Amino acid sequence: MKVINSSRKVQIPENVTVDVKGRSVKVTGPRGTLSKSFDHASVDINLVGKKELTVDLWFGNRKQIACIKTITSIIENMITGVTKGYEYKMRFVYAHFPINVAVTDGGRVVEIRNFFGEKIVRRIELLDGITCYRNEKAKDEIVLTGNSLELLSQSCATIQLRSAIKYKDVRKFLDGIYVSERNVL
Amino acid sequence: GRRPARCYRYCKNKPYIKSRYCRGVPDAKIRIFDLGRKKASTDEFPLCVHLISLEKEQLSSEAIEAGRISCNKYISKTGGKDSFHMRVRVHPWHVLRINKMLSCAGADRLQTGMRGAFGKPMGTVARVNIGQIIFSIRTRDNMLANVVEALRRSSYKFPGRQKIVVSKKWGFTAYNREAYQKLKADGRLMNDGANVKVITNHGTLAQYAKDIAAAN
Amino acid sequence: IEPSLVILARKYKCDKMICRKCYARLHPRAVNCRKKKCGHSNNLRPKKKLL
Amino acid sequence: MSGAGSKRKNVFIEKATKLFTTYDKMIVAEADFVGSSQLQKIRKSIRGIGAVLMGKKTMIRKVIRDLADSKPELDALNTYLKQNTCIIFCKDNIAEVKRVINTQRVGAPAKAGVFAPNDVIIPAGPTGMEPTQTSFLQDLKIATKINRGQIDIVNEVHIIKTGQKVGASEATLLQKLNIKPFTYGLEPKIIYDAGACYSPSISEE
RNA sequence: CGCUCAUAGCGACGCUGCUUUUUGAUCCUUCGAUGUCGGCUCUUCUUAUCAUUGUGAAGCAGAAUUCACAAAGUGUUGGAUU
RNA sequence: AUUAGCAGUUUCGGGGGCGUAAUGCUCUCAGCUGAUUCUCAAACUCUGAACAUUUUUGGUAAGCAGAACUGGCGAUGUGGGUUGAACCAAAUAUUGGGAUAAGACGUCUAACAUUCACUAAUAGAUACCACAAAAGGUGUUAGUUCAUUAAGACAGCAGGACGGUGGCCAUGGAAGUCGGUAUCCGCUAAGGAGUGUGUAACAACUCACCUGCCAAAUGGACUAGCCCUGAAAAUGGAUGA
């Protein structure tokens, strides 16, 4: 069975304006522009005047019905990133070796030396909307911040993945840089 | 050890019993058959939970005994013995044969290779048909969850597909549950121990009142 | 060493639920191996702890 | 359908529609954080004078009682759409019930997601802070200012009421500190009468 | 069994398969002839992986070891007896 | 060939209890007898039909050995099954026209359109025939049955989760939470003498069950279509491409 019609509705706040042209949604907010294509769907993305945006699908079954909530929530992510963009908090846990962290803002990169006493320097660039800075207030914590969730959480996941103990017992050591908080404002 | 039971799985031979002519056949691996309380009166256990075979084959005696132990052990752990009474509704009468040949590296010299090929008896086997009950359990109605899991536990010792039905009869009888209840409440039932005997209309030609004063 | 950091670090690489065919980490509320080698099998145990 | 399953409502409705027409003056309460430790020490005082009776939104089965009684479930104040209630019924002490029912309260720290009563004060100041527990409060979004020699933000005025959830990071600031500013418990909303409202005013005393 | 704990690792009692690197079974080709053991030599293929690379599990604290996956790209010895 | 009890004898052969002791009363317990009960056989029968497919013996099996009926190959091509001694169609003088048979109809390759589902795997695609199983899947499609809900459902987020009592027992210590046994009460909408984590045992967190926001369908145990795991072999590779 494929249902005749299955829509959703996305509510545009008044300071945000979407510019959609054939499954190519482009929000514009006060703090920054954001865009994503949804050309991998048989979907008519379509806005109702100024306040609404209605993802629709005619005769979808499943693997297609399941995608309209996905591409509704991704447009909602693009909207929330351009009103009050996401800010992730990442904390250092170590057993004995204090993890040092460098940050410049050329490509806004992070450099992680003295991780487990390794002398390799873990220089890692951030995805191209993202900056980061150390927390002077709370000890041993770097807060990430950005405009898109798929860039910010992926940058955080690359910091977290590249901060592992290899060739050992991962249940004991637990030295790394993990995502603690996932706030918005 | 024993040859793989994929040889003796399907019944392609004429049936071949221990008799005057099949002399020295070894015994069956299933020694005891009926397990549980089994001094239980048939009013006690109303639930007939079966295990029928979906394909016809030769369920080996070595397989019936392993399934028997697997069914006994799980209910004895679950609710203790005497909470059930199962028989086993299949007996290993067909005996298998093996034209045994040597595992020697120079085996051309010794064994009559396919000369006088008629094998010597190994084991026994039970020739189940499709829809033939092999494990019938009689138990209380508070064990419909557990004895089906024990018959599922015994379905993996048996070759292929077994189906656990919950029978619509009073348990090891011929009459249905409301029909046994009619035959008890109307007074046409008796107490032969673990089975009934119905006061029929057949000795009612002069008298039948020897059955009336001892009715269930 | 703060206990909350140990709880956070066990949240990410210790509190898993490893499939039995697929020795493969899943989230702690899983019921099925997400991979083809398992057969999407619904047979899985927690990751064992330390003392 | 209805009237089935475990802990049946057809054996509760014998209390939820029958003894709800034998009473004079009642207290619409608040059971949003009230214990069973604090409840067993108030359900022995009411037990001699009345009862502690509520079906909890089964009470729209009271619509058949409103033929001649004209009892409101939605026409009075606090229209019963956003909260939990356990209304207090009395036969002997319909009058001096408001004094033992507002004595046995205990002050305690709140948690995350609690229903946030009308008197909540955030632990702040020099006595409401340690120099070691600053780094937890230094984790949050709000930047701090130096007032009376302490890394702290001051908020002693009421900002939250019933119907707004408390943030998750604010719970440990009440739990770890010994600061328990308000003694909370049962909260009377409306003084209800058999078909009308006796007192349409609040009285926490 | 693994102190407790079926399934870290195993795993009886049973059952279901695969392989053609053992030996049988058979006699279809070949008896106007396919030179038949082993070794030396040399190349290529297989993966049912010993090591190496990346990973995941453990009764993986470190070290050592054990189970599995993607993996056949590259290795996989000198000798006494016969 | 053979399983299990119930009854009668039952005193008996043996054990004992019972009148103070015995072929004296009763119980498993043996044994004899009766009405039942499970499976039953090529060499059993009251009754009892109508190389290839089928019946069929030895063999674990065979493209093995041996039989019976029928049809073939041998003797025989032709059209099809890519290919081919036996399969399907159909039998051969030399040919023309037409319609066909098995088989097919994207291209090789002569021959098509319309229509409804299923498959999302590098799968699958002409019986013999060139393989695949047990056991699995919260892959999807169809279905069966049972239960829940406007007496407010599942799910999410939160509030409660109390006393007698730390139940009896047992012991350095065992208090809900190492174990043998019971499992009722007060107060309520709702409490296991506790589903767990931990501890000198507690404490503390936690689940059962109820309730708050919410707004409408929810949950389970199966069934069997396709598909996936099971599924590893040597030259390079075969739905014929």
Radius of gyration from C-alpha coordinates of chain D = 21
Q: What are phi and psi of B179, to 5 degrees?
A: -80, -35
B96 lies in the same domain as B10: yes
Measured CA to CA in angstroms, residue D102 lies from B161, D34, D203 at distances of 69, 12, 10
CA–CA–CA angle A67, A69, A71 (5° rounding): 70
Q: What tokens appear for B153 in the block?
A: 């536990």
Q: How many domains does chain B have?
A: 2
3-state helix, strand, coil in chain A (%, to 5): 15, 30, 50
Interface test with A, best of D132, D133, D139 (most A CBs within 10 A): D139
Measured CA to CA in angstroms, residue D93 lies from B110, D88, D130, D190 at distances of 109, 11, 47, 17
Q: What are phi and psi of A78, to 5 degrees?
A: -65, -30
CA pair distance D108, D113, nearest whole angstrom: 15
Contacts of C49 in chain A (CB under 8 A): 171
Q: Which helix (H) or strand (E) holds A102?
A: strand A100-103
Amino acid at B12: K
B178 lies in the same domain as B155: no
Amino acid at D109: P
Per DSSP, what are the bridge partners of residue A124? Answer: A110
Q: How many CB pairs under 8 A join A and C?
A: 34
B200 lies in the same domain as B133: no
Domains by residue range for chain A, with CATH:
1-85 (3.90.930.12), 86-185 (3.90.930.12)
Chain F positions with a protein C-beta closer than 7 Å: 1-7, 35-44, 56-62, 64, 118, 134-142, 147-152, 157-163, 186-191, 209-214, 228-230
Q: Does A160 sit within 8 Å of C49, measured CB to CB?
A: no
Q: Which domain holds residue B102?
A: 1-173
- Residue that the structure tokens 């545009």 belong to: A12
Strand A24-28 relative to strand A17-18: parallel, antiparallel, unpaired?
antiparallel
Please give, rounded to a whole number of angstroms, the shortest distance from the CA of A91 to a CA of chain D. 10
Residue A127's region, left for phi above 0, alpha for psi from -120 to 50, else beta, is beta
Strand F closer than 7 Å to the CB of D121?
A: no
- Residue that the structure tokens 């914590």 belong to: A141
Q: What tokens appear for D174 in the block?
A: 């009440």
Strand F closer than 7 Å to the CB of B120?
A: no
CA pair distance C30, A161, nearest whole angstrom: 22
Is the sign of the CA dihedral D186, D192, D193, D194 positive or negative? negative
Q: Which chains border A (3 or more CB–CB pairs < 8 Å)?
A: C, D
**Secondary structure string (H, E, C) spanning D58-112:** CHHHHCCCCCCCCCCCCCCCCCCCCCCCCCEEECCCCCHHHCCCCCCCEECCCCC
Amino acid at A147: N
Cα D173 to the chain's mean position, in Å? 22
Per DSSP, what are the bridge partners of residue A145? Answer: A87, A131
* Residues ≥6 apart with Cβ < 8 Å to D131: D150
* Residues ≥6 apart with Cβ < 8 Å to B19: none
B5 lies in the same domain as B61: yes
Q: Which helix (H) or strand (E) holds A176?
A: strand A176-183
CA pair distance B158, B70, nearest whole angstrom: 11
CA pair distance B75, B180, nearest whole angstrom: 26
B215: DSSP letter: B
3-state helix, strand, coil in chain B (%, to 5): 20, 20, 60
CA pair distance A168, A170, nearest whole angstrom: 6
CA–CA–CA angle A132, A137, A140 (5° rounding): 65
Measured CA to CA in angstroms, residue B21 lies from B1, B116, D146 at distances of 26, 17, 108
- Sheet of B57-60, strands arranged across: B57-60, B120-128, B94-98
- Residue that the structure tokens 């046409």 belong to: B188
CA pair distance D60, D200, nearest whole angstrom: 22
CA–CA–CA angle A51, A52, A58 (5° rounding): 165
Contact A13, A83 (CB under 8 A): yes
Q: What tokens appear for B29 in the block?
A: 């691996």
Q: Say whether A58 sits in a helix, a strand or coil.
A: strand
Is the sign of the CA dihedral D74, D76, D77, D83 positive or negative? negative
Is the sign of the CA dihedral D178, D179, D183, D187 positive or negative? negative
Residue of A74, A139, A63 whose CA lies nearest to A101: A139
Q: Say whether A181 sits in a helix, a strand or coil.
A: strand
Radius of gyration from C-alpha coordinates of chain C = 13
CA pair distance D133, D175, nearest whole angstrom: 12
Helices (H), B59-115: 61-78
The set of long-range contacts for B19-23, using a CB threshold of 8 Å and a minimum separation of 24, is B22/B95, B22/B121
Residue of B40, B42, B53 whose CA lies nearest to B175: B42
B115 lies in the same domain as B136: yes
For chain A, the farthest-separated pair of C-alpha atoms sits apart, in whole angstroms, at 61
B214: DSSP letter: G
Measured CA to CA in angstroms, residue D9 lies from D2, D14, D72 at distances of 9, 9, 22
Q: Which of A91, A160, A172 sits opposite C5 (nearest CB)?
A: A91
Give chain D's length.
205
Per DSSP, what are the bridge partners of residue B93? Answer: none
Please give the protein residue whose CA is closest to the C1' of the nucleotide F213. D82
Residue D148's region, left for phi above 0, alpha for psi from -120 to 50, else beta, is left
CA pair distance A115, D183, nearest whole angstrom: 49
Domain ranges of chain C: 1-51
Residue D102's CB is within 10 A of a number of other CB atoms, namely 17
Contact B85, B36 (CB under 8 A): yes
Residue D135's CB is within 10 A of a number of other CB atoms, namely 16
Strand F closer than 7 Å to the CB of B50?
A: no
CA–CA–CA angle A90, A95, A97 (5° rounding): 85
Contact A136, A86 (CB under 8 A): no
Distance separating the N- and C-terminal Cα atoms of chain C: 17
- Residue that the structure tokens 């996401």 belong to: A86
Distance separating the N- and C-terminal Cα atoms of chain A: 43
Strand F closer than 7 Å to the CB of C37?
A: yes
B130 lies in the same domain as B92: yes
CA pair distance B150, C24, nearest whole angstrom: 31
CA pair distance A131, A86, nearest whole angstrom: 11
Q: Does A183 sit within 8 Å of D144, measured CB to CB?
A: no
* Residues ≥6 apart with Cβ < 8 Å to A114: A97, A98, A99, A100
Contacts of D135 in chain A (CB under 8 A): 137-139
Domain ranges of chain D: 1-107+183-205, 108-182
Q: What tokens appear for B187 in the block?
A: 């007074």
Measured CA to CA in angstroms, residue D79 lies from C10, D27, D62, D65, D117 at distances of 46, 15, 15, 19, 18
Using CB atoms within 10 Å of the CB of residue D95, give its burial: 0 to 12 exposed, 13 to 18 middle, 19+ buried.
exposed
- Kindly tell me whether chain A and chain D come into contact, counting contact as 3+ Cβ pairs under 8 Å: yes
Residue of B105, B107, B155, B109 whose CA lies nearest to B134: B155
Q: Does C14 sit within 8 Å of A171, measured CB to CB?
A: yes
The set of long-range contacts for B78-83, using a CB threshold of 8 Å and a minimum separation of 24, is B78/B143, B78/B146, B78/B150, B79/B143, B79/B146, B81/B36, B81/B37, B82/B36, B82/B37, B82/B40, B83/B36, B83/B37, B83/B139, B83/B140, B83/B143
Q: Which helix (H) or strand (E) holds A80?
A: helix A65-83
* Residues ≥6 apart with Cβ < 8 Å to D85: D28, D29, D30, D31, D54, D56, D189
B204: DSSP letter: T
Side-chain-side CA neighbours of residue B180 (13 Å): 22
CA pair distance D72, D78, nearest whole angstrom: 11
Residue of D112, D106, D107 whose CA lies nearest to D171: D112
- Residue that the structure tokens 């013995």 belong to: B81
Q: What tokens appear for D77 in the block?
A: 């104040």
DSSP C5-49: HHHHHHHHHTS-EEESSS-----TT--S--STTTTS---EEEPP-
What experimental approach yielded this model? cryo-EM
Cα C47 to the chain's mean position, in Å? 5
B89 lies in the same domain as B13: yes
Interface test with D, best of A86, A89, A137 (most D CBs within 10 A): A137
Closest nucleotide to D83: CA versus each C1': F212
Q: What tokens appear for D78 in the block?
A: 């606090």
B102 lies in the same domain as B116: yes
Interface test with A, best of C13, C16, C49 (most A CBs within 10 A): C13
CATH number for the domain formed by residue range(s) C1-51:
4.10.1060.50
Side-chain-side CA neighbours of residue D70 (13 Å): 3
Contact A57, A66 (CB under 8 A): no
B143 lies in the same domain as B215: no
CA–CA–CA angle D173, D179, D182 (5° rounding): 110
Separation in Å: F159 C1' and D82 CA: 14
B67 lies in the same domain as B24: yes
B164 lies in the same domain as B209: no
Contact D104, D40 (CB under 8 A): no
Strand F closer than 7 Å to the CB of D80?
A: yes
CA pair distance A168, D63, nearest whole angstrom: 68
Residue of A142, A139, A136, A137 whose CA lies nearest to A122: A142
Q: What tokens appear for A50 in the block?
A: 């100024």
Per DSSP, what are the bridge partners of residue A103? Answer: A110
Q: What are phi and psi of A68, to 5 degrees?
A: -75, -30
The set of long-range contacts for A110-113, using a CB threshold of 8 Å and a minimum separation of 24, is A110/A142, A110/A159, A112/A159, A112/A162, A112/A163, A112/A177
CA pair distance A20, B28, nearest whole angstrom: 79
Measured CA to CA in angstroms, residue D86 lies from D120, D171, D190 at distances of 22, 26, 12
CA pair distance D91, D169, nearest whole angstrom: 45
Q: Which of A138, A183, A185 sits opposite D138 (nearest CB)?
A: A138
- Residue that the structure tokens 């720290």 belong to: D109
Residue of C nearest to A165 (CA): C13
Contact D194, D69 (CB under 8 A): yes
CA pair distance A121, A110, nearest whole angstrom: 10
CA–CA–CA angle A140, D145, A110 (5° rounding): 30
Cα D154 to the chain's mean position, in Å? 26
B181 lies in the same domain as B160: no
- Kindly tell me whether chain D and chain B come into contact, counting contact as 3+ Cβ pairs under 8 Å: no
Strand F closer than 7 Å to the CB of D114?
A: yes
Give the CATH number of the domain where residue B198 resides. 3.30.60.300
3-state helix, strand, coil in chain D (%, to 5): 15, 10, 75
Contact A185, C21 (CB under 8 A): no
